[PDB]
């Protein structure tokens, strides 16, 4: 019923409209700081709508003390403090294997837009410079090794579309997976030395921040493209671009960046990097299933129903 509810940035206008519907919304943007919602709303909310830009932060958990639920439009909780959350009580749901798919997929057309240099090729038609000669040549993506930092559902879903192009598949992190035919390594730098595309398929925890730092991409080299899929904190983001700058680094297919909308300037004028605006799941399909799955776990919480999606 009309319960409080906020909504932490614009995520899904479906989403939105059936929070303003079923529940009583609060939109965190009509109020011009946070502190203008806890001062007026501290105890009208009971359930976060938040997403990978804006969570549920320890400050935001505090300010709410009648907070009984996070649900997430997104499979990543680094923007939850969850240990916060179980300690007072209060569920967190999230949107996983529906949006596995989807980034997979973003992260093979990454791979592809960045070997064989398609936004480039693109821009080369059409400025007109075909008339001129022909497009440089690239580099063939079937047969290339393909090493995946994170062997989860997303991780396990580029590996199987990856395979489909005979690509030699290894993989890092924890402890070595069973029923895989993979190549395990312990470490990413020795990950990163034995593959040519690198990719970010990881949570992003305090352990895997800057998880591609300047070391890995020295092992990386040269000839080597880094694919992240992740978070922007993932890799340390100055580092990439000063090795790109100097040569040290062949290219990037970047989907996140530490402080987006930005994205470095210096990238802007790179041909061997592919930038999006963190379009992972940002599908007509997908993104619909994730916003039923978060007002699903909502309807079954306050109806007193076992949540669908939970993680603590």
């Not at 319960?3 to 965190?28: A, H, S, W």
């Not at 976060?48 to 649900?71: R, W, Y």
């Not at 990856?162 to 069973?178: D, V």
């Not at 299933?289 to 776990?297: E, H, I, P, R, S």
Request: aromatic share 6%; with cysteine.
């Amino acid at each position: 019923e009309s319960i409080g509810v906020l909504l932490t940035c614009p995520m899904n206008p479906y989403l939105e409209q059936e929070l303003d519907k079923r529940f009583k919304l609060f939109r965190f943007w009509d109020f011009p700081s946070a502190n203008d919602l806890f001062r007026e709303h501290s105890n009208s909310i009971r359930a976060v709508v938040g997403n990978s830009f804006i969570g549920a932060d320890a400050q935001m958990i505090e300010a709410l003390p009648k907070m009984e639920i996070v649900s997430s439009f997104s499979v990543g909780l680094d923007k939850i403090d969850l240990v916060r959350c179980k300690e007072k009580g209060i569920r967190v749901t999230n949107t996983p294997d529906v949006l596995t798919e989807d980034v997979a997929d973003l992260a093979l057309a990454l791979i592809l837009a960045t070997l064989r240099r398609i936004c480039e090729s693109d821009r080369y038609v059409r400025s007109g410079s075909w008339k001129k000669g022909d497009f440089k040549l690239t580099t063939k993506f079937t047969g290339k090794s393909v090493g995946i930092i994170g062997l989860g559902r997303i991780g396990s879903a580029i590996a199987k579309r990856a395979e489909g192009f005979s690509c030699p598949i290894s993989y890092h992190s924890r402890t070595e997976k069973p029923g895989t035919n993979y190549k395990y390594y312990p470490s990413v730098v020795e990950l990163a030395s034995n593959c040519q595309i690198l990719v970010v398929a990881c949570a992003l925890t305090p352990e895997t921040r800057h998880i591609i730092n300047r070391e890995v991409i020295n092992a990386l080299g040269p000839k080597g493209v880094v694919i992240n899929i992740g978070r922007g904190l993932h890799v340390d983001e100055p580092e990439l671009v000063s090795a790109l700058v100097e040569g040290r680094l062949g290219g990037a297919g970047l989907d996140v960046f530490e402080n987006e909308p930005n994205v470095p300037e210096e990238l802007l004028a790179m041909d061997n990097v592919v930038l999006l605006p963190h379009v992972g799941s940002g599908t007509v399909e997908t993104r619909k299933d994730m916003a039923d799955l978060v007002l699903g776990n909502l309807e079954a919480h306050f109806l007193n129903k076992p949540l669908l999606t939970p993680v603590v």
